[PDB]
Amino acid sequence: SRRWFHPNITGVEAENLLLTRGVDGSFLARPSKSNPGDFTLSVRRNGAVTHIKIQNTGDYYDLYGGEKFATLAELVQYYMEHHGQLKEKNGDVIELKYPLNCADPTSERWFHGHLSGKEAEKLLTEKGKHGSFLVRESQSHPGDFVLSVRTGDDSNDGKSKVTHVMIRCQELKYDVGGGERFDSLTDLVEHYKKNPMVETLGTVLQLKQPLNTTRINAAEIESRVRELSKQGFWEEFETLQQQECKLLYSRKEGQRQENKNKNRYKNILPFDHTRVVLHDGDPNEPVSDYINANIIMPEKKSYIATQGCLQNTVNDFWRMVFQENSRVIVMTTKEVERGKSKCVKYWPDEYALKEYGVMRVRNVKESAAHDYTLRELKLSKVGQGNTERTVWQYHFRTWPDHGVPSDPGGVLDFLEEVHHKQESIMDAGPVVVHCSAGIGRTGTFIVIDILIDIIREKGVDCDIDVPKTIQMVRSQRSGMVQTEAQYRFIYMAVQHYIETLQRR
Numbered sequence: 012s013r014r015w016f017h018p019n020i021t022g023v024e025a026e027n028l029l030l031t032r033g034v035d036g037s038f039l040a041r042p043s044k045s046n047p048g049d050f051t052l053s054v055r056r057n058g059a060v061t062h063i064k065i066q067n068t069g070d071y072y073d074l075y076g077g078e079k080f081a082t083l084a085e086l087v088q089y090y091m092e093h094h095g096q097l098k099e100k101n102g103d104v105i106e107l108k109y110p111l112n113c114a115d116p117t118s119e120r121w122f123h124g125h126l127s128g129k130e131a132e133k134l135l136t137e138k139g140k141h142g143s144f145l146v147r148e149s150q151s152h153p154g155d156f157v158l159s160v161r162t163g164d165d166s167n168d169g170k171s172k173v174t175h176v177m178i179r180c181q182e183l184k185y186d187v188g189g190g191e192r193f194d195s196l197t198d199l200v201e202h203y204k205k206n207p208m209v210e211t212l213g214t215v216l217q218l219k220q221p222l223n224t225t226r227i228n229a230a231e232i233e234s235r236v237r238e239l240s241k242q243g244f245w246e247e248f249e250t251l252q253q254q255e256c257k258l259l260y261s262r263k264e265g266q267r268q269e270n271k272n273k274n275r276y277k278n279i280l281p282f283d284h285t286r287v288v289l290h291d292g293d294p295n296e297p298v299s300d301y302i303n304a305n306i307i308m309p310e311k312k313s314y315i316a317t318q319g320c321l322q323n324t325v326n327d328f329w330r331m332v333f334q335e336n337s338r339v340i341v342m343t344t345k346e347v348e349r350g351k352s353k354c355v356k357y358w359p360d361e362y363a364l365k366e367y368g369v370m371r372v373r374n375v376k377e378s379a380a381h382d383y384t385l386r387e388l389k390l391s392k393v394g395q396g397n398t399e400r401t402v403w404q405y406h407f408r409t410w411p412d413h414g415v416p417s418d419p420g421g422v423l424d425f426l427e428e429v430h431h432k433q434e435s436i437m438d439a440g441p442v443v444v445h446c447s448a449g450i451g452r453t454g455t456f457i458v459i460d461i462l463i464d465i466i467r468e469k470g471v472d473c474d475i476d477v478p479k480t481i482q483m484v485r486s487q488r489s490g491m492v493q494t495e496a497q498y499r500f501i502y503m504a505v506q507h508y509i510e511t512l513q514r515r
């Protein structure tokens with residue numbers, strides 16, 4: 012759960028909450044509603060409140076006087092399980108002990124406040140399934156709410172139905188007319204999710220899934236983008252973010268002492284269940300199986316999402332490319348940005364040959380395009396001539412230092428080319444995609460590519476679901492797609508791709 016995040020709170024409301032309803036060690040996180048990608052962690056300690064800034068420009072959450080994290084949930088998990096670690100500017104330890112829980116329902120998938128009764132009925136009737144539900148504000152009784160639920164089989168023949176349950180708001184708590192009174196709609200829904208309501212004649216009002224309203228027909232993207240552009244994008248994104256607490260999968264291998272220095276950022280780590288395991292390592296190397304990389308399998312083409320190489324991981328990077336039979340690499344950072352190293356140069360200069368441990372790489376030819384450079388590399392294993400394969404490195408060079416491109420056309424041209432190269436090579440393995448930490452630009456590029464592939468096969472007349480696709484990729488590497496700016500950009504790129512298919 013993720014109740015310590017408060018989407019709609021001011022700095023002063025945050026202090027007031029912590030001072031009046033928290034104790035020393037209580038904490039909450041919140042957005043800045045001006046500056047997007049700015050967050051604040053507010054912590055009570057010694058009877059006063061501290062505000063700690065968290066910045067995300069697209070690559071990671073950067074806690075001031077702390078570490079870099081792939082999600083806020085991973086950030087909170089880390090500090091709640093590691094005392095003495097978060098520190099004030101002038102030295103002192105800041106303890107995160109007691110989450111201060113938020114009552115606001117606006118980020119719950121099931122909350123559709125504005126929805127009217129008939130609007131709710133049609134949605135559940137057309138889009139919904141057995142156990143699909145939503146909660147809406149009452150029209151007849153202001154301040155109250157309505158739970159609307161579809162139940163039945165899986166044509167319109169009476170096999171299914173919608174029932175409406177009134178939720179009263181009484182002196183600040185919520186109820187369904189009897190029993191327990193709840194501090195929040197979330198507590199109410201969670202309770203009736205585990206303990207379903209039974210109608211008098213024995214229909215069970217099972218709350219199985221929130222109604223899906225994000226699945227759209229690709230042809231109607233422009234219409235969804237229009238609707239979301241009225242800040243709805245913030246809403247839909249934060250709803251996705253609320254579900255990141257479901258994705259706290261183990262990352263034990265990356266936490267091994269032997270693997271610590273193989274990670275660019277010590278707490279941005281590959282999930283165990285999807286990490287790329289390297290075989291045939293040096294038998295004098297106690298741990299030679301680890302690289303900070305995960306397989307991303309869409310639910311024909313798969314990806315490896317990885318970090319920019321460190322000087323001490325370049326040999327492992329090439330062992331991975333060879334082992335997985337990858338024939339295309341996508342790089343989405345310059346080697347250096349804002350004077351800081353984002354990815355060491357792991358390839359030879361044009362026309363040169365270098366050995367990287369047991370792997371040999373020749374840079375055959377570099378071709379410069381407007382937004383990218385293409386390097387044609389030849390990769391082989393030392394001592395084995397017949398292992399040579401060409402690996403095409405697509406190096407995107409014009410991504411802005413912070414935030415996202417103001418137009419998706421360069422990225423889409425680039426991905427179209429990457430896609431065709433990959434499709435031209437029989438039995439090519441996964442496409443390697445990396446930036447700096449390998450979660451923000453990397454996740455943005457992979458998600459766009461997945462979505463555009465669907466359309467590419469099926470056409471404008473098919474279903475896409477942007478946040479569902481992102482949740483699926485985020486179950487395979489932590490924090491894939493970092494910011495609301497990237498989220499918006501994914502929609503703008505799909506929109507742009509669709510319009511260019513209508514113009515042809």
Ligand SMILES: Cc1nc2c(-c3cccc(Cl)c3Cl)c[nH]c2cc1CN1CCNCC1
Nearest residue numbers: 117119120122224247250251254478479482
């Ligand atoms: C229904 C819904 N679903 C989503 C998802 C979503 C989709 C598929 C899988 C997963 Cl795990 C997720 Cl989170 C991300 N944003 C969403 C927004 C909504 C609707 N809004 C309406 C306004 N009030 C907040 C809800």
